[model samples]
Target: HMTRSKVAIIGGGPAGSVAGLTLHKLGHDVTIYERSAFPRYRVGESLLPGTMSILNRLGLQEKIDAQNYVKKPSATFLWGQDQAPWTFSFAAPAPWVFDHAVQVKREEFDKLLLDEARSRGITVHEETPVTDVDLSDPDRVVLTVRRGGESVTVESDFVIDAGGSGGPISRKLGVRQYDEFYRNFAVWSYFKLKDPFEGDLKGTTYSITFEDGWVWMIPIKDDLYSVGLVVDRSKSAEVREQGADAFYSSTLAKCAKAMDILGGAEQVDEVRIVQDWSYDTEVFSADRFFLCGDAACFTDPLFSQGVHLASQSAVSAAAAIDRITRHGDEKDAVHAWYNRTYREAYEQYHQFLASFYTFASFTEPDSEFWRKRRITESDDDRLTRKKWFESFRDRASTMIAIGRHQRPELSDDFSEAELNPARVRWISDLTKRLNSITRFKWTGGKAVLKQHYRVEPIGFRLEQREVLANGEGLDMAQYPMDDEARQIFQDLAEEEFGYKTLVKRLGAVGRQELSTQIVVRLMEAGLLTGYDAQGEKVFVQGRLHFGGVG
Candidate 1:
């Protein structure tokens, strides 16, 4: 049994409710403080497929289905090339992807999660805003909150800042830094459509990019559409000079695709402006408090990963908190894992967006927005995009294996060779090494090498200390070797080993059948081609090729 501890979560947003619900399920005394009342307006309504798995764990499928949210199986975009709008459906290969996602009115959907948290025995305080946090003790957090016009302080074993970006905890810490690379603002409003699309198109989201900005049109419920425009922050002065309504109206007129759909629509809400600057905190977890969701990081909503990241981070934070509470000695390791998990998820989306801007084909060359992105392209941007795309594909394989292990139902739709936990761990570790390595080759010929090499008997540690020809200097890479792997490397140094010979040798040593698979990965990593003139340079091809280079 896990030890129960007091957990105070600030802000009853999706992230806060998710952390609260998970902690409550683990038998913790949990309380959530939310400043706003239920059913209040909020933005960012799209949901991703991963959210379904988390929601299932929370046992809230019934409540989710009870809402009037529209089903979103795919997204349509009038982006990239100018010929025709392209659609990416989640259905073809796996029914689970498309059948899972939905678009909701955030106000109602957020309230639903909060209510579910309450039903699960988590204390919920609405209309309560956290004003201050004192981490002077380093072991406990004291939060000053206001309720019914009275100020009160609440102390907890652990504090979770699941609030949005502007929450008090992030402000007090003063760690939030804006991502100047993606400086932008949003202007949005709701509309009642007189001519609505029919069938599957009704629920699908349509995104159109113009010279000045991009517009996202989402179907909420009834005949209303949630329309928003995301524009560069450089145009802020123009928007201010013209006023929000005038700016929004002019921007809407510029987008032919959006105007086609909303031409006759009547505005049902006042135009509102939001400074949607992308930013992230330098650190996600401190001594006694953890930041989740937007409180930790915020990114461009191009991929609609905001809520997915929030819910995923909440689950990860709750799990870390639970583990650290049970085993105090593992606190540092647990916290490190939490940071990596959230950062990788954020980087995945951020890298994708960065590359999209570079790779996406645009017809409006005359538009400064599109032209500036290309003109401002840096080598660092190119390298970051390349590294992440590689990481993305490598991580996808890991997730597929994990999904197969945890969800056998997916096996029917997707197939993967059976793997044990040890093999999966090895694959994951190898993938991490691959993500860092750009190119590698062996020192060929009879000339003696000056690099240091050492081997340990126990756990079979193989170490190599040499200067990498590529920029990363004084590389001291280490590898854990089993008897079979060790033998294979020794054989490679003496003579080249073919796939058949390697497999037979590994079989004789009673190694797993997947030794061939591991060997292929090592070869791809330039680890197996010792003293060979020909070496493999592995480059991942993403959605777009750089400078026509794949």
Candidate 2:
């Protein structure tokens, strides 16, 4: 039997590290078992706004910022056959994005975070693996761990299984892998690009979809960018035949933005490929062990949401374990907290992935690649993914019903809580004054939205300020909005709401639907702010008169 440790976190990636840090902060004796050394090359460096908030609470934002990583303002969905790429800025929750994002190289960043946990006095073991875990006793669980040919047995109040995708814990526990519907694969590498082409120095990440699959270009400080391809597994044979160079060349040709960055670029590392890539775990928690990170579930990298959701699960798991330990084995309450938070967060992530796959690409049926993507299966748990247009094929119609209760109503259906008559009047008066003024009319030409906005045609803030400023006796003409205007929104959204809301507003439409290209171009140039929010570019919004960015 082990000594009196409160929690045992298995795996030391973002999930495990987060669990350790949070548990330690809550005054628990936490230890993390990592299977590899720190600072090792690993993928999935992109983080969602939610993850940024997690870091902020931990007070580690400064350390992350000190590391030279790109700052992405938002996520873009590019489809050539369609209009331009649709954008979703970081404005959904602006306050978090302005300061919290870290386009980290996972190898170093993960190590840095783990080190912080260790600093907080959480026991950490690198290159350690849990060889065996016994959960036969519902009241307590025991694990046998190994490191460098040495072994020890540990008994803990509970276990947080953050063992990544390949970890053996979940598979050993008979957690069902839902492989019946999803199929995907990934190939990635880092590259060095010379000057003349100054990549997003301020930090930018991109996703461009082609006929076959999609490429994610995530910027690292100093012209280094991490690039990867996530494609339909059915095209595995063809992609293998083309090999790395051909695949890279063909995909680059399809992306105008990517080619611009790679103009004088050269691969600086070997192509790393991950096949049969998909998120497929069903059992998130059991009697004494709760799976976290890729161990509990996973999704493709299209949205860069993997890290954010992982952090969320990790923190919640820590909280649940803390509650159990503090409350003296009230396992039911702990189980409820763990199951509720993990399931909700995972389902939410799965819904986002469904949206990207629905309209982002994979819509072209003529090619085998596109055909396979269209037919690829997804988990329909709770049927929370009906809007992605896969409702017919999912057979798991429960998703539609679940989505109805939780998701925003479709635009055609445009249903929402009844607006207060007085509030509507107030907004209407505000809208009229803002819309009729020439200063508010975007002069940057018809700018396409980088992402979705709840309001029609354009996002509200910049235009609101422009219109409001005219009445302030300032020459609104002095406020010039060029392509750089996009950064303004990125900064504003991040500074104001943090990161969650930004992900929502920058979308060209609701999460379930794609705004038509016509709709995108018709929006006022102020809509260019969408780009700022979509990419990681830093844009500091209005000065802190009231206190700080909203």
Candidate 3:
């Protein structure tokens, strides 16, 4: 009997759709099982520039952008006790068409990509959840799928488990487990504000630390934004178990800025909380089934690396499955590729999260929060998170924000046969900048800061450097600082010589308590010296290291 050459993808999220489409393009019969229907709500909306590259490769970039995705140039950072915000842009190498992060409406974005996959000849079954995957036979991976409360079994040569965190197949197979160290929850709701952020729907994402956890505000489209509080499980459970109102009030109480504006805003929908949602995998695969995205491994949403890793892993899994089908009986090659790519991506995020926790500790209330975060190996298989700052070790003046960058130079080291060969020119050029940043002289012992005092103008520049260099009045936000802080900054900028305050100086005369703290904390972090300062800080004219935040 001729074997049916089919690949079953369990889950229609980013990983499943991308992989399903790729497999179909490779001429394999592909079916994607998804529980949610089109235009369903979900979080994790920020898309890194790298994600755009993936879509472009799949010929779906135009489709995505046409559906009204917000264009984002960079991500912003604000830490410390003094309240200053630093913005980091993806400014490296020559510009590529898709070399820009974007804020996409997840409801529309996911559906669009799924539609594109369908257009590319992949079958997508929405509202159909996979209940089981029989992996007893290595040659045939069968799935029991549920639709309209009715269940049926699906048999395929290969099973691609891209079912995300709620993967039924992986759970039923007893190959999936959650790590409590990264264990957390999110309470999200959509709100429409009378005073929504202005301009071109330029969406922004932020992580504002609260007493027990943090909150994220991600803009989706129109004036509609996705806002939520993602809390550490230990902290979140108390507030939630009390009641929704109490939980919300307690969560909001931690964020003065968000609370102030969002108080009057009407809730467009019911507030939903996703609990016990962080973890990777105990085993990403067994027999012929392979996991993708959160189904394989998961990291904190603080870095917004979710979609990026998902798209990357999806493509990687697709390529591996394609090869395995073509070269039968090559289980070694298949499993080897799975282990290499899966571990690399998983380890990358784990290390990235670890580094972020280290950098963020400076602003946390106490070492209690930091210590808990530092030694959060509460469960098994939860690897001790090595200090990521140590990875950037060079006995430099201060540790740099290695998490603020993606070292394309390092890409080749991990790439399979040179990942994205077309990106060679881009990576080679970017490597030069990356190398410069590796040993960047961030803090000049007040000497370099003084040097920048004479070089850079006192005020901020609103327009791009090229535009402003030629002399144009670009309206920039006010550098907020009181007489005392402002005088101190001015004197320091003057005496420090080459140094100018790169962080935004906000006038918090009427801002909320957290906003005040935001500004204060930023000023405190900016005072410290690190790698980001040389390439990023001291380079800006006004107080802001980067033009805009987020």
Better of 1 and 2 by lDDT: 1
| Root-mean-square deviation of Cα positions for candidate 1 versus the true structure, in angstroms | 10.6
What does candidate 2 score on TM?
0.65
Candidate 2 colliding pairs, count: 55
Error (Å) of candidate 3 at residue 506 is 49
User: Best candidate per lDDT, number?
Assistant: 1
> Candidate 3: misplaced stretches above 4 Å?
1-4, 94-97, 147-149, 194-202, 257-266, 367-369, 375-550
Q: Give the per-residue lDDT digits (tens) of candidate 1, residues 1-550.
A: 3476799999999999988988777667899999988978999997776676577656777777777577775555666434334343444222222244788888988998999988887899999998888889877889999988989999999999988977777788788888756777899998997325554344667777887768999877767788999887877898889899999988888888788788878899999888887888778896788999899999888767788888878877777777778778767866766776567567666655654565442345545565544325586765664443331334333332332222322112212223245345755665544454433343232112123333221111223333111122212123234444454545544555444565567677765565545545445444444221234434322122111011
Q: Model 2 segments beyond 4 Å from truth?
A: 1-5, 80-82, 92-100, 194-202, 238-247, 250-257, 328-330, 360-365, 375-550
Tens-place lDDT digits, model 3, residues 2-68? 2325888988788888777666655668888888788787778877767676667667756765676
Candidate 1 clashing pairs, residues 3+ apart or interchain:
none
Report the Cα lDDT for residue 430, model 3: 33
lDDT of 2 by residue, 21-73 (tens): 87776667888888788888888877766677777677787787677566665
Candidate 2 minimal-lDDT segment of 10 residues? 453-462
TM-score of 3: 0.66
